[PDB]
Amino acid sequence: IKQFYVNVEEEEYKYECLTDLYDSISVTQAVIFCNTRRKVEELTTKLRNDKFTVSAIYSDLPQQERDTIMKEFRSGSSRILISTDLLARGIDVQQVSLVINYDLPANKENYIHRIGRGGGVAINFVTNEDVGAMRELEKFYSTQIEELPSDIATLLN
Ligand SMILES: [Zn+2]
């Protein structure tokens, strides 16, 4: 799993960075994690308005609804699956090649459950306010989270 970060500088630039990235890296399906249900719902709404097909999973969903959502994703009906930090470990991201942390994990431990299973590329969005916490992450683990390259056309090969 290759781990990168994009310094979006401020929360407001995250949405545009996500959609531009989505096009630039030419990926089809991706999983996105946010730290709160509210952010998941808001990002899902914006994405859908922009014509993207998205599925969202929340804790308040009964097992039936979650299993439906997953089938929606696995079949390709939805190109994007968005979930919360709390549900990351319970989400069986298949061999999805791209995972995006729209919000940098606030719980350092949960980070390894938010980077996929090898598809494997994980991209972390950080603002000037989160950059520090990211460094702590690199220490908490013995890994290296590199700044995303200027040219990612061949990112996921
Ligand atoms: Zn764990």
From Swiss-Prot:
Signal peptide: none annotated. It is found in: Cytoplasm. Residues 1-156 form the Helicase C-terminal domain. It comes from the Eukaryota. TIF1 and TIF2 code for the same protein. Component of the eIF4F complex, which composition varies with external and internal environmental conditions. It is composed of at least eIF4A (TIF1/TIF2), eIF4E (TIF45) and eIF4G (TIF4631 or TIF4632). Interacts with eIF4G1/TIF4631 and eIF4G2/TIF4632. The Q motif is unique to and characteristic of the DEAD box family of RNA helicases and controls ATP binding and hydrolysis. ATP-dependent RNA helicase which is a subunit of the eIF4F complex involved in cap recognition and is required for mRNA binding to ribosome. In the current model of translation initiation, eIF4A unwinds RNA secondary structures in the 5'-UTR of mRNAs which is necessary to allow efficient binding of the small ribosomal subunit, and subsequent scanning for the initiator codon. Belongs to the DEAD box helicase family. eIF4A subfamily. This is ATP-dependent RNA helicase eIF4A. It comes from Saccharomyces cerevisiae (strain ATCC 204508 / S288c) (Baker's yeast). The chain holds residues 234 to 395 of 395 of the full protein.
